[PDB]
Write an enzyme that holds these catalytic residues in place. Structure first.
Site, PDB file in Angstrom:
ATOM      1  N   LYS A  44     -16.079  43.485 -55.763  1.00 34.53           N
ATOM      2  CA  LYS A  44     -15.888  42.959 -54.418  1.00 34.53           C
ATOM      3  C   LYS A  44     -15.438  41.500 -54.369  1.00 34.53           C
ATOM      4  O   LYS A  44     -14.896  41.072 -53.356  1.00 34.53           O
ATOM      5  CB  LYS A  44     -17.140  43.157 -53.575  1.00 34.53           C
ATOM      6  CG  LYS A  44     -17.506  44.620 -53.336  1.00 34.53           C
ATOM      7  CD  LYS A  44     -16.351  45.414 -52.726  1.00 34.53           C
ATOM      8  CE  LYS A  44     -16.807  46.703 -51.997  1.00 34.53           C
ATOM      9  NZ  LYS A  44     -17.728  47.538 -52.810  1.00 34.53           N
ATOM     10  N   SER A 266     -23.154  53.423 -59.451  1.00 30.09           N
ATOM     11  CA  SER A 266     -21.808  53.945 -59.135  1.00 30.09           C
ATOM     12  C   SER A 266     -20.901  53.993 -60.388  1.00 30.09           C
ATOM     13  O   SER A 266     -20.004  54.826 -60.454  1.00 30.09           O
ATOM     14  CB  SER A 266     -21.133  53.152 -58.003  1.00 30.09           C
ATOM     15  OG  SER A 266     -20.677  51.882 -58.459  1.00 30.09           O
TER      16      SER A 266
END
Ligand SMILES: [Cl-]
Ligand SMILES: [Cl-]
Lengths: 300, 300
Positions: A44, A266
């Protein structure tokens, strides 16, 4: 001299590493793109700087602008870091259920937190940000799910890194979908450059929305948003693989203990899928790149 | 193709960043070497791989070898990660006072922990490792304070990175001393190549041993070992700067909030010293490189 002017110039350019042990049954080569090498330990960081860069370049940042985003994950960390580097005031909304550890991390970067009712969860956080932005024009809201700078930064950076580092030999890219920015940007560039390339989206079996199923609760932080993300170009996605919670956790464990790659859940989920694709006889000899979005230390 | 065979090939090669705001009174340029970019977020990744590499290269690792080290800091993390990548069994001794967070991190990499009496602190942990190694010849003990591979890796990697990234313009290097490996290896290479270069060691005001004072307790994790480290070449050190606990903390805070650099308290301490050196009129126009050993998230 090779000296960055500020920390945001050191975002991206993450390495590839070959998986050696977490490869059971593989007939294809599996290489992992290590987004934990970003300055704040996740993918991110790319969109945190890209979204603010696009705003700057479009004249949207004013002398009294305050950055505002509802966030329960890595985008809050990325925005907090980038705003600290930029000298911007940063306000983040999130449920009061958020951990003290996460709040301390965001506050360490100088971000200001607005905690919303626990019972209302993330919808309450989004509602609060919506109301704040409507009533106070100082706020600029990046909107990570809708901002075109999200897939764009992945076209300009992530995709080119994959292309260059594999000398154009990448055959298949496997990536978890949260906002869909990563897999979309990579596919936009690589599929057009190498039409034979294929792209596998990964989501939770517990919330198999892209697969046509219904939203549900799940612990695979970073993916499985519970809706089709607007940024996702589904026409570029060649396959969806659902991954169970236990498999994701188990493989995340194996990456740490067997590869020395301490990654988030993830990343476990993405690797479950990559290993499945890698066992297919038609993929013998192919090069699979799997994106590992973040570092595992926060999940302990 | 640019693909690492394993995570240990991605250790070091950390970037430099220019300090922009945490520069009050500076007449010299201050640039920070960001050791948090290492895969497990500290400088010790370099010595974790280097010490095992040197053992491998010297035929010291046997089929039944178990890696053993007493550790309460980053070297335990580095060894745990490297051993996971290598497929080595890793046993670490430490006081039972060590945090649950730290124990979970080390165990996530598959390391096995031997907890020693809290009252005996680190001397008890060292005693346990000593006894284990004496009575079981399977154990190989890296000995981070005495192992010549510690300063050697800093000669081969850290020093050359500083040299190349500054195009040989580095004038002064400022570094906290724990084992002394970082400042020693860098000075060995750079002072011989550029005799005008100078080297500033940083220690806690609370435990000013290098300065000629007495050992004492202090919270600046990573430096201030309480003795003169055997690896340290004091003849290469041109100056020692003591740093108070509050100043170190305050500057560490400023780096996070004003530069977007979330670093440990020893990075705060090193930067206090760099800023002091940078204010000296005789240093006008000079290039100061300050080493920031680790990421701050673990200290929250
Ligand atoms: Cl988020
Ligand atoms: Cl240590």
């Amino acid at each position: 001299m090779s000296i960055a002017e500020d920390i945001t110039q050191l975002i991206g350019r993450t390495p590839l590493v070959r998986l050696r042990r977490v490869t059971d049954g593989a007939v294809a080569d599996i290489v992992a793109k290590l987004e934990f090498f970003n300055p704040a330990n996740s993918v991110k960081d790319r969109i945190g700087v890209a979204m603010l860069q696009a705003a700057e370049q479009a004249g949207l940042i004013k002398p009294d602008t305050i950055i505002l985003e509802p966030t329960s994950g890595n985008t809050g960390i990325a925005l907090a870091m980038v705003c600290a580097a930029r000298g911007y005031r940063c306000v983040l909304t999130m449920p009061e259920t958020m951990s003290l550890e996460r709040r301390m991390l965001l506050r360490a970067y100088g971000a200001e937190l607005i905690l919303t009712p626990g019972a209302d969860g993330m919808s309450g956080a989004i509602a609060k940000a919506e109301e704040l932005a409507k009533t106070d024009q100082r706020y600029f809201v990046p909107q990570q799910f809708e901002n075109p700078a999200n897939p764009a930064i992945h076209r300009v950076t992530t995709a080119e890194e994959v292309w260059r580092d594999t000398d154009g030999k990448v055959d298949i890219v496997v990536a978890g979908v949260g906002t869909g920015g990563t897999i979309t940007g990579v596919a936009q560039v690589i599929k057009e450059r190498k039409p034979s390339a294929r792209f596998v989206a990964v989501e939770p079996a517990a919330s198999p929305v892209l697969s046509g199923g219904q939203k549900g609760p799940h612990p695979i932080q970073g993916i499985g948003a519970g809706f089709v993300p607007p940024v996702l170009d589904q026409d570029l996605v060649d396959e969806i693989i659902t991954v169970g919670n236990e498999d994701a956790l188990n493989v995340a464990r194996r990456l740490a203990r067997e590869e020395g790659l301490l990654v988030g859940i993830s990343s476990g989920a993405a690797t479950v899928a990559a290993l499945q694709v890698a066992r297919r006889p038609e993929n013998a000899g192919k090069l699979i790149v799997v994106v590992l979005p973040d570092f595992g230390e926060r999940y302990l």
